[PDB]
Motif scaffolding. Structure first.
Motif, PDB file in Angstrom:
ATOM      1  N   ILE D  41      68.413  16.145  44.322  1.00 26.77           N
ATOM      2  CA  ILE D  41      68.082  15.669  42.980  1.00 26.77           C
ATOM      3  C   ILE D  41      66.989  16.539  42.372  1.00 26.77           C
ATOM      4  O   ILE D  41      67.020  16.861  41.179  1.00 26.77           O
ATOM      5  N   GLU D  45      67.430  18.708  38.989  1.00 27.11           N
ATOM      6  CA  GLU D  45      66.504  18.520  37.879  1.00 27.11           C
ATOM      7  C   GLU D  45      65.846  19.835  37.477  1.00 27.11           C
ATOM      8  O   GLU D  45      65.709  20.125  36.284  1.00 27.11           O
ATOM      9  N   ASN D  55      73.235  17.215  31.334  1.00 23.97           N
ATOM     10  CA  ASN D  55      72.763  15.918  31.807  1.00 23.97           C
ATOM     11  C   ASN D  55      73.198  15.647  33.241  1.00 23.97           C
ATOM     12  O   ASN D  55      74.300  16.015  33.654  1.00 23.97           O
ATOM     13  N   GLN D  57      73.237  12.402  36.208  1.00 25.55           N
ATOM     14  CA  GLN D  57      73.139  10.961  36.416  1.00 25.55           C
ATOM     15  C   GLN D  57      73.151  10.711  37.916  1.00 25.55           C
ATOM     16  O   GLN D  57      74.111  11.078  38.600  1.00 25.55           O
TER      17      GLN D  57
ATOM     18  N   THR F 146      74.105   4.606  36.792  1.00 27.71           N
ATOM     19  CA  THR F 146      73.246   5.773  36.634  1.00 27.71           C
ATOM     20  C   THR F 146      71.782   5.420  36.868  1.00 27.71           C
ATOM     21  O   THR F 146      71.388   4.250  36.849  1.00 27.71           O
ATOM     22  N   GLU F 147      70.971   6.457  37.091  1.00 30.01           N
ATOM     23  CA  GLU F 147      69.532   6.303  37.249  1.00 30.01           C
ATOM     24  C   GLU F 147      68.710   7.249  36.385  1.00 30.01           C
ATOM     25  O   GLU F 147      67.560   6.917  36.075  1.00 30.01           O
ATOM     26  N   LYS F 148      69.246   8.402  35.990  1.00 29.78           N
ATOM     27  CA  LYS F 148      68.489   9.372  35.211  1.00 29.78           C
ATOM     28  C   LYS F 148      69.374   9.932  34.107  1.00 29.78           C
ATOM     29  O   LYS F 148      70.605   9.879  34.177  1.00 29.78           O
ATOM     30  N   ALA F 149      68.723  10.474  33.079  1.00 25.56           N
ATOM     31  CA  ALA F 149      69.411  11.110  31.963  1.00 25.56           C
ATOM     32  C   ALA F 149      68.454  12.045  31.234  1.00 25.56           C
ATOM     33  O   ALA F 149      67.331  11.653  30.903  1.00 25.56           O
ATOM     34  N   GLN F 150      68.886  13.279  30.979  1.00 22.52           N
ATOM     35  CA  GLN F 150      68.002  14.276  30.392  1.00 22.52           C
ATOM     36  C   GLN F 150      68.839  15.400  29.801  1.00 22.52           C
ATOM     37  O   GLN F 150      69.911  15.716  30.321  1.00 22.52           O
TER      38      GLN F 150
END
Lengths: 53, 240, 153, 141, 83, 167, 65
Positions: D41, D45, D55, D57, F146-150
RNA sequence: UAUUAAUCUAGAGUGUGGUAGGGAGUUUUGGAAUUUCAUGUGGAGCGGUGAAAUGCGUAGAUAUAUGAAGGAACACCAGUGGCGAAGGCGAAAACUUAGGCCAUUACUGACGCUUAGGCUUGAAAGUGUGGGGAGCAAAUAGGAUUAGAUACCCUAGUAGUCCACACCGUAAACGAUAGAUACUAGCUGUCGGGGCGAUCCCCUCGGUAGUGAAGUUAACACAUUAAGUAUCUCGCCUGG
């Protein structure tokens, strides 16, 4: 393989039967192998799938 | 209007089970009865893009060709295009190279025109066998140049009735820098034409409409009365 | 449009009696402005084949970018299994390359380059591989713009 | 984003990432899936932060034990993907570790290197600035 | 006769666990005994000989893991056929 | 283990000796049972099979332990009153699907197809219609979120236009 | 023209669908190949086994009508 | 990078429901057909290739028809095949039954994969033992085209071929394609599973194949089973 239709029509129908038997039983006078037997089975399968479909 | 839903009466349908992955965008996947159906909205949007681009090309005043290489239907369509707007067009065999190689074809069409002019000037000055051979050669040149003999300059833009049916045309257009407009089918590939439009040739409702609207774009570009591209459902030219 | 030749291939096709000699040639065209174009053709004699190759090569001309005018990232080019390796030479070490490699590098407008040709010595695929290796390099501006991060570092 | 189906585990997760990304760009696909590690992760990122992919998820089913991640590939307005072919550096059996003095700059100041030095994923410039070296994970340029 | 469900419900560690390493090795051992009777009855069964080798050495791997990870996980599993 | 047995009795003899064959084969099955006593009448045998040219066909469909097969075959072959003793088990492969009631449409429509000689049927024995609803029941479900979004990313619409303009 | 996926019985044995088995059997006591039967071939190979059994059971002759 | 603990399985695999195949080996049965044996007949031929010839034959050969013994493998079924660790499997049946297939949410819970070491098998030949030589046939015997010819062919005939313990543990062992993991179109066509319908023309995922996108390759050509994509591992080719 019996064929009884008429005096001569029976033989007319028997012509195809005789051809089939001659083509089926012709492989008992020369060299052959079981692997080559499966090979020629696949080959005739391809022949009837391409021409006869 | 411009490729409105009504104008495509029934242009959905194609051959059984032939469709590319990225052709799943413009054409929906296999039907329960094995038919590739051409969607309407994407057809409309792609034809809108092609219409605006050909309109601005006509404003630029370039040279265009309406390709009628198909036997009867598209040939008749492009005949209507020519009788509505005067434009050079190709209906006979699009030769395998007439834009990347046109020098010795320019001299060939010039020889053809000069020989016809001489025959008009000539009146039986020789033996009749030589005249028979003259007509023989004229018709020999016609059966290959019958399509490509009306343009003396390389086109600035061309249309295509089917990307696979006009391999020579698209090849010579990709050798040059002119964009390509084609009526892609689900058995074709969409990575070959600069303007991909899901228009079926098997289903005439799309191809007839697109030919008429491509004519109408340059018609309104030339300030003359326009036949179609504003009707909810244009002429039903369904081929038997 | 220099239309410089690099290698002619002596060939002959067998036919009904005798052998037709139709030796091929390969030419590279450039106009000192970075334009590059390669073309291979063949004919009965030298001038016709040279002219055909010149036409084929000049039909497509390509210019490549120059920044730190060496191959600023190590890369090996293969075209039909021919190894041509180009690696960044500093701008003060002097150019050390092969003749065909020197021709390809200098026609593109570059500078000193760390080259190494390997294995086979057939100049046709040598030129093809060198062209593929030099032309497949990306510009700093390319990644600077394609990536969301504008900074090129 | 509910998966509606769990993906099958690879021999190694970073090679799964590489295979999925390369086959997505090869098959003209825009969405990629991979396992979810704190390392992985973090690497995804940091790839996003440098404009390489779109994006991401992180999908957790019922615990951190079953965690995956689905990330979109960046596609510039020129239809050119920012992913020029991802590669792994922390290779199983080819684990290459470079000190702070051996931190390189990717193809002469054009690309980005992913370095987990001593506390987490760090890009090349900050890794040089932080005077701390460590594992080099993946190369994307 | 493969002992498909019978050997699986025996060595369960939890309330519902039909794939427990214990029950996997029990199934492997049962199949090894069955395939050994097979091999002694059929000395020329090459495919089954290969499968038996696969099963027995996979059992060895599973036992190695069960000793490596958790002691209790193989504290109740000391019935592996030996001697 | 499923089991079938087909018995062929000695020649064209009377049905009484066929029943005697039945009785003889009854004791051969020691304890594995489930058989059904049925007869298919007298049927001819085209070629000389063991010594005869006809027989009476019998079938017994039992189930249970699979050890009572070899003895059956040998005692029926040794006995002259039987020419065929055949026993069928798992090496014969067939279907016993737990979901067989959706096939009742096939049950009715093939009997209609075998009776296609009547005018009252429009469906041919080989008629392409594609009537299946294409049910799947073939997805491995899993609950996640989901857990993140960017960094939202978008691109132009998927219609290529070369140079975008030529005016 | 399948006769076992069409009938939906899905159960193949010696004597329960003999006429369906013979539907792929020519009067010449010979079975048509896959390229002639054109079925799912589970039922066709079951026909193969069942009618070779029938030849062994002397239902149909080896080489005769 | 590796270890620690456990729940999550998602690959290792496992359960429930179904499931195709000539898988293998062992066992059981059968005779269409030939030879011996039985009934005969009959006249002058049979045997056969390139033309014929060797050879059998008036004492009855070839032929003619079935029947007991015998043993080989089991016309079609036979699949742009299935299964199978490649190797190999086609009368039918049984026992063990390996693995193929999905519905596989569920399940110990990273256990995993390659793997020199090692274990096994690897066709068949041939061969130690017990059988038949009915049939075939290496070697063998003869005739025959080559300048001879052992080589094409034909006829017969020992071991052997066929069976069991088997051995040689070698191949054109071929997909000339090492395995395992994750992913990659379409289409062409054979097959399996679940699902739901008359069967083909329905969907999903896989086994064995191909054209072919991207991809790969020196090209031919791989291409969902890669020679791809990346990983892991072993062995090999660094000229003949």
């Amino acid at each position: 393989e019996v064929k009884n239709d008429d005096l001569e029509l029976a033989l007319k129908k028997f012509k195809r039967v005789s051809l089939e038997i001659r083509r089926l039983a012709q492989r008992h006078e020369y060299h052959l192998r079981k692997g080559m037997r499966l090979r020629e089975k696949r080959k005739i399968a391809q022949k009837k799938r391409r021409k006869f479909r | 209007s411009l490729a409105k839903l009504g104008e495509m009466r029934t242009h959905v349908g194609m051959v059984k089970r032939y469709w590319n992955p990225k052709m799943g965008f413009f054409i929906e996947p296999e039907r329960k009865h094995n038919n590739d159906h051409f969607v309407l909205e994407l057809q409309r949007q792609s034809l809108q893009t092609a219409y605006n681009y050909v309109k601005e090309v006509a404003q630029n005043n370039g040279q265009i060709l309406f390709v009628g290489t198909k036997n009867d239907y598209v040939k008749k369509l492009v005949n209507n295009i020519a009788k509505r707007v005067d434009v050079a067009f190709i209906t006979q065999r699009w030769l395998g190279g007439t834009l990347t190689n046109f020098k010795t074809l320019s001299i060939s069409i010039n020889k053809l025109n000069k020989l016809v002019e001489k025959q008009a000037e000539n009146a039986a000055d020789l033996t009749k066998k030589e005249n028979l051979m003259l007509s023989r050669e004229i018709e020999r040149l016609e059966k290959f140049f019958g399509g490509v003999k009306s343009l003396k300059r390389l086109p600035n833009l061309l249309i295509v009735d089917d990307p696979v049916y006009e391999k020579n045309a698209v090849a010579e257009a990709n050798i040059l820098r002119i964009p390509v407009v084609a009526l892609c089918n689900t058995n074709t590939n969409p990575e070959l034409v600069d303007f991909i439009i899901p228009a079926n040739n098997h289903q005439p409702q799309s191809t007839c409409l697109l030919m008429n609207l491509l004519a109408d774009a340059v018609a309104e570009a030339k300030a003359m009365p326009t036949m179609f591209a504003y009707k909810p459902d244009e002429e039903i030219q369904i081929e038997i | 449009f220099e239309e410089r030749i690099v290698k002619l291939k002596r060939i002959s096709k067998t036919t009904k009696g005798g052998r037709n000699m139709r030796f091929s040639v390969l030419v590279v065209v450039g106009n000192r402005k970075g334009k590059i174009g390669y073309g291979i053709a063949k004919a009965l004699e030298v001038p016709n084949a040279i002219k055909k190759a010149i036409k084929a090569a000049h039909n497509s001309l390509h210019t490549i970018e120059i920044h730190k005018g060496s191959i600023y990232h190590e890369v090996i080019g293969r075209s039909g299994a021919s190894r041509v390796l180009l690696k960044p030479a500093p701008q003060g070490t002097g150019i050390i390359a092969g003749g065909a490699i020197r021709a390809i590098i200098e026609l593109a407008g570059y500078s000193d380059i760390y080259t190494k040709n390997l294995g086979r010595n057939t100049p046709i695929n040598m030129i093809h591989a060198t062209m593929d290796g030099i032309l497949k390099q990306l510009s700093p501006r390319r990644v600077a713009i394609l990536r969301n991060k504008n900074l090129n570092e | 984003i509910t998966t509606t189906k769990p993906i099958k585990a690879h021999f190694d997760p970073v090679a799964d990432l590489l295979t999925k990304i390369n086959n997505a760009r090869k098959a003209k696909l825009m969405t990629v899936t991979t396992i979810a590690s704190k390392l992985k992760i973090a690497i995804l990122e940091i790839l996003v932060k440098e404009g390489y992919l779109a994006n991401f998820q992180v999908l957790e089913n019922k615990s951190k034990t079953k965690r995956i991640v689905t990330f979109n590939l960046k596609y510039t307005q020129r239809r050119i993907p920012s992913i020029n072919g991802v590669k792994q550096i922390s290779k199983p059996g080819l684990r290459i570790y470079r000190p702070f003095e051996k931190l390189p700059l990717v193809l002469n100041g054009l690309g980005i290197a992913i370095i987990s030095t001593s506390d987490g994923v760090m890009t090349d410039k900050v890794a040089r600035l932080k005077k701390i070296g460590g594992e080099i994970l993946a190369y994307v340029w | 006769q493969i002992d498909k469900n019978g050997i699986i419900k025996s060595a369960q560690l939890h309330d519902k666990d039909v794939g427990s390493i214990q029950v996997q090795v029990s199934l492997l051992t049962s199949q090894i005994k069955q395939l050994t009777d097979h091999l002694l009855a059929n000395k020329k069964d090459f495919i089954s000989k290969r499968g038996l080798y696969a099963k027995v050495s996979k059992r060895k791997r599973l036992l190695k893991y069960l000793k490596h990870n958790d002691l209790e996980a193989y504290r109740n599993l000391v019935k592996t056929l030996n001697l | 283990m499923q089991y079938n047995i087909i018995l062929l009795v000695d020649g064209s003899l009377s049905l009484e000796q066929a029943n005697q064959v039945n009785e003889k084969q009854q004791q051969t099955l020691t304890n594995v049972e489930g058989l059904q006593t049925e007869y298919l009448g007298l049927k001819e045998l085209a070629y000389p099979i063991k010594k005869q040219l006809s027989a009476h066909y019998y079938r017994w469909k039992f189930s249970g332990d699979n050890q009572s097969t070899k003895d059956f075959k040998r005692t029926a072959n040794i006995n002259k009153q039987v020419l065929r003793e055949l026993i069928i088990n798992l090496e014969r492969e067939y279907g016993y699907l737990a979901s067989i009631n959706p096939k009742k449409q096939q049950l009715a429509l093939q009997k209609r197809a075998k009776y296609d000689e009547i005018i009252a049927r429009e469906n041919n024995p080989e008629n392409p219609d594609v009537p299946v609803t294409s049910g799947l029941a073939s997805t491995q479900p899993r609950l996640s979120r989901t857990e993140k979004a960017q960094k939202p990313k978008e691109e132009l619409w998927d219609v290529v236009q070369k140079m975008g303009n030529f005016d | 023209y399948c006769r076992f996926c069409a009938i939906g019985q899905l159960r193949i044995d010696l004597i329960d669908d003999l006429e369906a088995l013979k539907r792929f059997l020519s009067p010449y006591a010979k079975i048509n190949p896959r390229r002639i039967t054109g079925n799912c071939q589970m039922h066709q190979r079951h026909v193969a086994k069942a009618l070779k059994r029938a030849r062994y059971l002397a239902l149909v002759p080896f080489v005769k009508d």
